[PDB]
Design a protein around this ligand. Structure first.
Ligand code: 9YT
Ligand code: FE
Length: 138
């Protein structure tokens, strides 16, 4: 038996924050289920190029709006209830108009190394600046 809660995972080592996405990992390779499972926020205004050569991924949008553009294929708007699955290891752009909340399943599971390494993802456009600078401790 495994029991977890998103509200425990947030702001913890299983919450991986990147320039375009915050992935809250629910089932890890360690959990032995044969897949990994996460709840990922795709930040508003962002664009990320994605290509998982070594995994298939299912993505189910439960909040927000954006689009996925398949390189050499079509562009599919993303809204709550939209599901896509990359059974052909498709290279794709993932764009968020508003913040998107995505339940994601990977077939072999992703490892912690792969998530930290951002393997298979290339962030291209980050959220608009909030006015902060690294050199402003205030
Ligand atoms: C929604 C999406 O595709 N996020 C990509 C990150 C992925 N969930 C991962 O953990 O590598
Ligand atoms: Fe994806």
């Amino acid at each position: 038996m495994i029991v977890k809660h998103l509200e425990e995972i947030v702001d913890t080592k299983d919450d991986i924050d990147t320039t375009t996405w915050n992935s809250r990992r629910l089932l890890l390779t360690k959990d032995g289920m044969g897949f990994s499972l996460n709840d990922t926020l795709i930040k508003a205004g962002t664009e990320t190029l994605i290509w998982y050569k070594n995994h298939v991924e299912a993505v189910y949008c439960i909040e927000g709006e954006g689009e996925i553009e398949v390189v050499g294929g079509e562009t599919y708007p993303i809204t709550p209830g939209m599901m896509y699955a990359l059974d052909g290891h498709e290279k794709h752009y993932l764009r968020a108009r508003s913040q998107m909340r995505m339940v994601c399943v990977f077939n072999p599971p992703l490892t912690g190394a792969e998530v930290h390494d951002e393997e298979g993802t290339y962030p291209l456009l980050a959220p608009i600046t909030d006015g902060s600078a690294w050199s402003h401790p205030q």
